[PDB]
Subunit: 124 residues, 4 copies
Amino acid sequence: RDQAGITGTWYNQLGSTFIVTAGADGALTGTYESAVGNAESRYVLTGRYDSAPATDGSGTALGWTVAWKNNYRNAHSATTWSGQYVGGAEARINTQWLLTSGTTEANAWKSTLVGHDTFTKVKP
Amino acid sequence: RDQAGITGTWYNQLGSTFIVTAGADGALTGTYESAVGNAESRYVLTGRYDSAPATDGSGTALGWTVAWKNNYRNAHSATTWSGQYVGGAEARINTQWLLTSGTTEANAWKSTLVGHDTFTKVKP
Amino acid sequence: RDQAGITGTWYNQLGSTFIVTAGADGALTGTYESAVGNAESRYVLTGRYDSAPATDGSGTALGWTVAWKNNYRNAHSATTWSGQYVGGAEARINTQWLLTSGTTEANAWKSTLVGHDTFTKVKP
Amino acid sequence: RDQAGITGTWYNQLGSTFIVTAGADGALTGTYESAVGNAESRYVLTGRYDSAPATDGSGTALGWTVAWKNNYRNAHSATTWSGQYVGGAEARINTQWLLTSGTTEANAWKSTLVGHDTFTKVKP
Ligand SMILES: O=C(CCCC[C@@H]1SC[C@@H]2NC(=O)N[C@@H]21)NCCN1C(=O)c2cccc3c(N4CCc5ccccc5C4)ccc(c23)C1=O
Ligand SMILES: O=C(CCCC[C@@H]1SC[C@@H]2NC(=O)N[C@@H]21)NCCN1C(=O)c2cccc3c(N4CCc5ccccc5C4)ccc(c23)C1=O
């Protein structure tokens, strides 16, 4: 269990802030603040992690979602990050993400961005 | 709000079963059973949706995660689906997904599968 | 060798037209016309396929790129499709694609769309 | 035209080597050697780039494919990279990639890896 390793405040390469609690049962709960895009302040996130990872030096699989609606803005979109937690002196969460916007059926082909974020426990 | 539209039992093209409740506040909670892969029975899922979508015929953005650990198996992996709900006679959730396995740093380049699932309210 | 199987005119679910020749050496050459987006008429494509696939009923891996510049328009973007050819009565090329736009460094996080196209030998 | 900027030898974070020539007409031709996976020596690549990019500080969109068959091995797979070239003192090609394996129809859901490579003109 990397419950203690995951729980806390993380920062990515864009200067976004991910604040998460890992539950003993595999839950992830917290808030996300994006440094970029159609976003202001904090947004709810929820997700899941592997609470019993392999003991062979592998990372810990996890993922989470943010819907980009809060009390300030609604960007009619949702991002999911999928990745793994790697513990140790320079702990990191290495992710790839999919960001889908609500679209008409005609525009569905251009609904989804893909990218990658790396989170660390220390900021830019 | 497509709270009522989203809530329920959905099936994809592989014969997997997604059982979800949509909360008024943007939460998604439920269980997932995969017809394929290193999986048996139900797994917890959690996610988020846009509870106030655009009124212009656009779909409703949403996403969710499953960590592939339950009481029967642990596949040391997590999938996130990102997509949109489209209401109407033939309601569907159109998704793309990222499935990350825990890996060593040496194998991280081959950690993540990508695919697409389409869910409907009626099964194969 | 599915050189003969691949060579020809293919259509996707959007009504786009892919015209390709497969070389004995693994080359793919041809033109692409998109039914959607910032595109008009034909664009050059090039790519590669596995000219000696497994004999066990597996599909044939292949990919190709289009840069969205021709004599009519320049959309400062490029798409790559990655996928497999499946032969037989209802032959199909099943792909996932990445479409990158040129961006400033500040906007690089939103540079790349992801999607999926299925090509068949008969049109909508 | 970043024909001169693109042409040359590039290295990614895995220690792979990409050797490319950019044509005046938008072509990319060359060889790829992977430091990882089911690969040995050089493989043919082909692709396309935007030969007339925006003059506003944007990167130059490009993509290319490798089919993982040469005279030494056949991995029954193909990778496509989609990304942009960014010129200047520390020139880089920032990419995301899709790697599809030939599979049976039953295994198609697990056919495609996704990742990201950053290429520079100087090696690890
Ligand atoms: O901004 C937000 C909320 C904050 C998101 C922050 C992200 S989460 C991942 C990353 N990590 C991080 O910490 N922070 C960032 N939500 C909307 C985000 N958004 C999309 O959803 C979207 C979805 C689909 C297409 C496009 C899009 N194009 C592609 C090119 C193109 C070409 C011709 C015509 C049309 C288009 C459309 C452009 C921008 C967008 C977009 C775009 O901003
Ligand atoms: O190795 C090569 C040639 C060299 C590729 C080098 C890459 S190009 C991108 C990157 N940049 C670079 O410079 N060098 C690397 N070709 C085959 C590569 N390859 C796939 O195509 C593949 C395709 C689909 C699934 C899987 C795969 N899983 C995912 C997890 C899973 C779980 C349960 C059961 C099954 C599976 C299957 C594992 C490995 C592979 C794989 C795998 O090695």
